Write a protein that binds this ligand. Sequence first.
Ligand code: HEM
Ligand SMILES: OC(Cn1cncn1)(Cn1cncn1)c1ccc(F)cc1F
Length: 527
Amino acid sequence: IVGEALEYVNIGLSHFLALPLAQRISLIIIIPFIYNIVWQLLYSLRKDRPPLVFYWIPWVGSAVVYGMKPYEFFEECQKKYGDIFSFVLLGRVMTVYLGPKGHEFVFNAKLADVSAEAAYAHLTTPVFGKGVIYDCPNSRLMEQKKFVKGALTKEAFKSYVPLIAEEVYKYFRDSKNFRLNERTTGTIDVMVTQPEMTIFTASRSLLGKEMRAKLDTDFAYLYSDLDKGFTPINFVFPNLPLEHYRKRDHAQKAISGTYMSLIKERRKNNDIQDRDLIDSLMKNSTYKDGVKMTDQEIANLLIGVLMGGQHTSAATSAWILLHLAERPDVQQELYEEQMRVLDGGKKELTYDLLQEMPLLNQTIKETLRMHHPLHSLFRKVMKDMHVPNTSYVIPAGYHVLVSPGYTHLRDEYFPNAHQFNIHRWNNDSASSYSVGEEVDYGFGAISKGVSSPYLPFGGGRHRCIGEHFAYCQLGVLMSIFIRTLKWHYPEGKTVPPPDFTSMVTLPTGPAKIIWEKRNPEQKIGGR
Ligand code: HEM
Ligand SMILES: OC(Cn1cncn1)(Cn1cncn1)c1ccc(F)cc1F
């Protein structure tokens, strides 16, 4: 009888609760372990679900292999399952869609279907501050992107180029890593030099002279603290009572506090011009519903834009130098282009002349092909999504993962994809280019289609707005490096593997190059 069965359930329940504590703990471990395996096996027959990568440890999932070797992971998954597959990652289910159709599925996904801010808020909000970027609705982000873009005009770039050039020269002159007036050769770690050059140049141009001057003080130490909070660990542990987390928060307060002081000081003196992004945001930061950004939110947006731009550009800078260190042929070819465009060095570098340097820009383009600083972009799925031409349905609660950087490294789309060749971009040296219909999400007309196999800057509503600033900064920086120095690897060394575990895919350190002055007698003037 079924009556007597229900009795033995209750009996079994009471015997269960009365087990020796060791077997209880063991059952605490074995039961969800067994349940997990059984759940996957069952999930398999679901043909309205993409294949799920098998994993042994519950919650953890494929985190370790994804965390350490994401492209090798994607490649293995791809030839087993094809272009669409899911995997468990630290409690989340990630649905990957590789290739151009994946680019379309995720970057062009409707606003109602996916949320970037739900994916990233816990990473970024504690670092940047409240009320901006991912700590706000999408419509607010769109307009923040529009506000920042107002300091990213052609006219702005024309003024930034000599400021950036000045900083590069000052760095060559003053940094312990160079001191070109005293040394004709030396060794550097590019993961030391490039983050420093990147912060000095980006500060001077986007933040202005005051904020640049601050980096000549121990205030510079706060950026390091803030920098240390920008880490994937925030995806698991956003806030922990350690000193790492307190130094982060303290820095965000002191740094935004500093920006606010400058802001309120400019407003008090009515000293608001068109010098920098701070000026720009002081004059142009009213949303379409008439609500103004607070001084705090302005400062916080400044932090995030600068920090995001910081890591992508520094990493890219580092890779350019690293690839060129074993390619004296490319160094030579870039140098000839410098001599031609700048009339033997007699012409001062300008933003317009930068545009007349196709090989230089192709080098940047090719470096971003081989080293997309962001190997995975995420969205949280908010409504059930049907996968076109499939029976797959991606349920709300899932995350979608797109990886243009993976496609960058596929021979199908880039022959001999693991060879560095700037000439694969001959007569195709633009940072990117819309060549079909365009669309405006709030921050300017951008390409409607996002099916290009090359997407260093993403696409759709979350597309990068720093692409031309990045080319301007990298361009000026590399133009001066090329014209000033040659460099090569220490004996036996080559391009290092990427460190896929940090927030951007930095080179594994220490990554050293040996530089030498092209003109040992050349001196850099100024104080
Ligand atoms: C080589 C350098 C850079 C690369 C490769 C890059 C790449 C990207 C990518 C792939 C995205 C899309 C992220 C997503 O879909 O989730 C993005 C978004 C964005 N980037 Fe960049 N970026 C670079 C430099 C910069 C710079 C210099 C700035 C600021 C001056 C910047 C600011 C932004 C902003 C404001 C967004 C929008 C985020 C959103 O809408 O959710 N980036 N970038
Ligand atoms: O897209 C990022 C955030 N992110 C996503 N994965 C890793 N970091 C990075 N980024 C893109 N360009 C520059 N940085 C971002 C976007 C906007 C922003 F203001 C900061 C920021 F970190």
